[PDB]
Amino acid sequence: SEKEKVEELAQRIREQLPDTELAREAQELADEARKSDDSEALKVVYLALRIVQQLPDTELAREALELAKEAVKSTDSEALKVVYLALRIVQQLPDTELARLALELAKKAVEMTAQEVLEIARAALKAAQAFPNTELAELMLRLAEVAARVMKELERNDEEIKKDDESLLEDIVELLKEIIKLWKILVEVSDVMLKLIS
Amino acid sequence: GPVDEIDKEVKKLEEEAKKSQEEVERLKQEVEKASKAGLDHEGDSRIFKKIHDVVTKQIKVILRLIAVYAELVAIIG
Amino acid sequence: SKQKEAIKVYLELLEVHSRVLKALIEQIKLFIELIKRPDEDLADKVRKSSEELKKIIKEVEKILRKVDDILYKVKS
């Protein structure tokens, strides 16, 4: 009965907000989900619409609507899973740093075409879902984001090598910076793990 | 169980990392030999392409290991 | 000239990540063993692997400074 849930939620949105961009984009999500035959996409649209209902005229609601649009437009199911986990994190704790981390991580994961980035993002999102409202969860989401950025920097390096010594050196520095940041975050996570085990 | 699956995946990724280390050794030797045989502009570009391939494979192995690390942290909490 | 230096930088990065792999696999194995059975001895080895990882981070930072010097020489 998921489609009926989505329809009733859209009706509630229509009742609550008149001639608002959130309402028009919610109707757009409604039609894009009705056209879509994927159950995961239906669940993601449901979650985004419910988040918009809970926080009307909010930055999180607008960004989540646009993220749900970008996720429905993508035909990759792994990206849909990542977006669903991130939107669930946002639904549980909206006014938290984890919400922003998960929103931006899903926004970047929709763009990424690498399967390893999607896998590590799903792992980090499930780790944050396991023990939410903790320092370790924030560190995990930030680590996943830094890994995605490392992949993006490698893509840039390749594309610039195909086609400038100063630009190559600049991109090498920008890669090593985020590499060091990734390993530092990993060491911090390992320290928190050491303290949790003892 | 989940830990058994993670351990199987870890053994497979360790074998893959050993293969990547072999690639690193062979690439270092090849770069040294090509430097001794004659450096060139287009030769430098070819060496760049090979090096980027090796770096890409190594980084993918690293990211798979880090994803398994994240799953393990989620399990232990 | 600069392409040769970039070649050497990438080779150094490869050699460093080769040891990063060993350290990270050691940490993952120690975590799996800790999940299987709680032993106090394993925490010391986890800390040792973490210290090795920190030393590797220091080496990467040294490489970054080496590249920063070349950037200064090229731009100015």
Author numbering:
A (entry chain A): 1 to 163, 168 to 202
B (entry chain B): 1 to 77
C (entry chain C): 2 to 77
The authors write:
We designed helical heterotrimers with specificity conferred by buried hydrogen bond networks and large aromatic residues to enhance shape complementary packing. We succeeded in determining three high-resolution structures for DHT03: the original base construct, a one-arm version (1arm_A21/B/C) and an elongated two-arm version (2arm_A21/B21/C long). We show that computational design can create cooperative ABC heterotrimers that can assemble as free-standing helical units or as hubs in larger designed assemblies.
Deviations between the crystal structure and design model in the repeat protein arms increase with increasing distance from the central bundle due to lever arm effects arising from the compounding of small orientational differences in the structures of the individual repeats.
